[PDB]
Design an enzyme around this catalytic site. Structure first.
Site, short mmCIF file in Angstrom:
data_model
loop_
_atom_site.label_atom_id
_atom_site.label_comp_id
_atom_site.label_asym_id
_atom_site.label_seq_id
_atom_site.Cartn_x
_atom_site.Cartn_y
_atom_site.Cartn_z
N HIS A 40 34.86 90.34 -71.96
CA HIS A 40 34.66 90.24 -73.39
C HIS A 40 33.31 89.62 -73.75
O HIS A 40 32.91 89.66 -74.92
CB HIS A 40 35.85 89.58 -74.09
CG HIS A 40 35.84 88.10 -74.13
ND1 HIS A 40 36.58 87.30 -73.30
CD2 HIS A 40 35.20 87.28 -74.99
CE1 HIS A 40 36.40 86.04 -73.66
NE2 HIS A 40 35.55 86.00 -74.67
N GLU A 52 21.06 74.86 -65.38
CA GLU A 52 21.03 74.25 -66.69
C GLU A 52 21.89 73.00 -66.80
O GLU A 52 23.02 72.96 -66.29
CB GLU A 52 21.54 75.23 -67.77
CG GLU A 52 20.58 76.35 -68.09
CD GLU A 52 19.44 75.94 -68.99
OE1 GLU A 52 19.19 74.72 -69.08
OE2 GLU A 52 18.80 76.83 -69.61
N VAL A 57 16.63 72.19 -73.76
CA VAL A 57 15.48 71.45 -73.23
C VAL A 57 15.20 71.95 -71.83
O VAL A 57 16.13 72.04 -71.02
CB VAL A 57 15.76 69.93 -73.20
CG1 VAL A 57 14.55 69.18 -72.64
CG2 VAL A 57 16.12 69.43 -74.58
N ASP A 84 40.09 90.82 -67.91
CA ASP A 84 38.92 90.25 -68.60
C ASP A 84 37.95 89.66 -67.58
O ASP A 84 37.84 88.45 -67.39
CB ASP A 84 39.35 89.23 -69.63
CG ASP A 84 38.21 88.81 -70.55
OD1 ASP A 84 37.15 89.48 -70.54
OD2 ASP A 84 38.41 87.81 -71.30
N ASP A 171 41.19 71.38 -73.86
CA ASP A 171 41.19 72.82 -73.64
C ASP A 171 39.75 73.33 -73.57
O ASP A 171 38.80 72.63 -73.93
CB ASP A 171 41.91 73.49 -74.83
CG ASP A 171 42.45 74.92 -74.62
OD1 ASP A 171 42.28 75.51 -73.54
OD2 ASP A 171 43.07 75.39 -75.61
N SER A 172 39.61 74.57 -73.13
CA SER A 172 38.37 75.31 -73.35
C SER A 172 38.38 75.92 -74.75
O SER A 172 39.42 75.97 -75.40
CB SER A 172 38.21 76.39 -72.28
OG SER A 172 39.31 77.27 -72.25
N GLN A 174 35.77 78.29 -77.97
CA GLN A 174 34.75 79.30 -78.22
C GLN A 174 33.40 78.86 -77.65
O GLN A 174 32.97 77.72 -77.86
CB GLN A 174 34.63 79.53 -79.74
CG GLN A 174 35.68 80.48 -80.37
CD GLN A 174 37.10 79.91 -80.48
OE1 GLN A 174 37.30 78.77 -80.87
NE2 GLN A 174 38.09 80.77 -80.24
N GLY A 175 32.74 79.76 -76.92
CA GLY A 175 31.49 79.50 -76.23
C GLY A 175 31.63 79.11 -74.76
O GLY A 175 30.64 79.12 -74.02
N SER A 177 33.84 80.89 -72.96
CA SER A 177 34.29 82.15 -72.39
C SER A 177 33.38 82.60 -71.28
O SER A 177 32.15 82.50 -71.36
CB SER A 177 34.38 83.25 -73.42
OG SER A 177 35.49 83.05 -74.26
N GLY A 178 34.00 83.15 -70.23
CA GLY A 178 33.28 83.64 -69.09
C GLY A 178 33.03 82.61 -68.02
O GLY A 178 32.67 82.98 -66.89
CA LIG Z 1 17.62 73.26 -69.80
#
Ligand SMILES: [Ca+2]
Length: 223
Positions: A40, A52, A57, A84, A171-172, A174-175, A177-178
């Site tokens: 998705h 990251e 930054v 998914d 919980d996890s 939105q954002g 995902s994956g």
């Molecule tokens: Ca960075």
């Protein structure tokens, strides 16, 4: 991630951010040239961002590598979110080091009760909106199939599992995902869906990675 903690920079070295001008999904590095994410999350124009911590930054450990090829699972259904999962090939191999590292695929599925690490740059609020700059983490157990199905009648397939806390608060979201669900050093889940975030009796639902290892390996072997 709602109710989690700041992971620490580069402490989750397989976590990637998928960027299309901004962060929009997580993923997991599974070898020097391939990332696992959620179907998705598919879109064109993906840059994979490895190494990251703060996604706003440049901190000195990043590797930014364009995707050359996306492969959504052959049986992905966007209405039910069954299957998914997608694979993303990088245009060049990442340089693997202590801060940018692949995560092992499972050779065996994980059981309810196993503790796992879920991570991402998603919303940290269950009412309202606040997106973090640095990577967030949550330790959470896999829930039984029966309790997952009781939470989401008519919605849990054999390719899904629940993890988290029925009482709410962790919980996890939105954002996220994956992104990864790692248990005992193996990638067992992909952040997939849920009703809201961190709500009572509505735990997160995750793609059951162990079901896909054969497909992942044979796809990598021919692409
Ligand atoms: Ca960075």
């Amino acid at each position: 991630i709602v109710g989690g903690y700041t992971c620490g920079a580069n402490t989750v070295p397989y976590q990637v951010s998928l960027n299309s001008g901004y962060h929009f999904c997580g993923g997991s590095l599974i070898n020097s040239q391939w990332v696992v994410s959620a179907a998705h999350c598919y879109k064109s124009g993906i840059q994979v961002r490895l190494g990251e911590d703060n996604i706003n930054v440049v901190e000195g450990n990043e590797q930014f590598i364009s995707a050359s090829k996306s492969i959504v699972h052959p049986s992905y259904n966007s209405n039910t979110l069954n299957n998914d999962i997608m694979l993303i090939k990088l245009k060049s191999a990442a340089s693997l080091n202590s801060r940018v590292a692949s995560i092992s695929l499972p050779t065996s599925c994980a059981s309810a009760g196993t503790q796992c690490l879920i991570s991402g740059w998603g919303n940290t609020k269950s009412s309202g909106t606040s997106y973090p700059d640095v990577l967030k983490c949550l330790k959470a157990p896999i829930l039984s199939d029966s309790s997952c199905k009781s939470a989401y009648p008519g919605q849990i397939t054999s390719n899904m599992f629940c993890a988290g806390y029925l009482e709410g608060g962790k919980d996890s979201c939105q954002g996220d995902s994956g992104g990864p669900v790692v248990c005992s050093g193996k990638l067992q889940g992909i952040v997939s869906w849920g009703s809201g975030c961190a709500q009572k009796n509505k735990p997160g639902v995750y793609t059951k990675v162990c079901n896909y290892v054969s497909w992942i390996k044979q796809t990598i072997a021919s692409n």
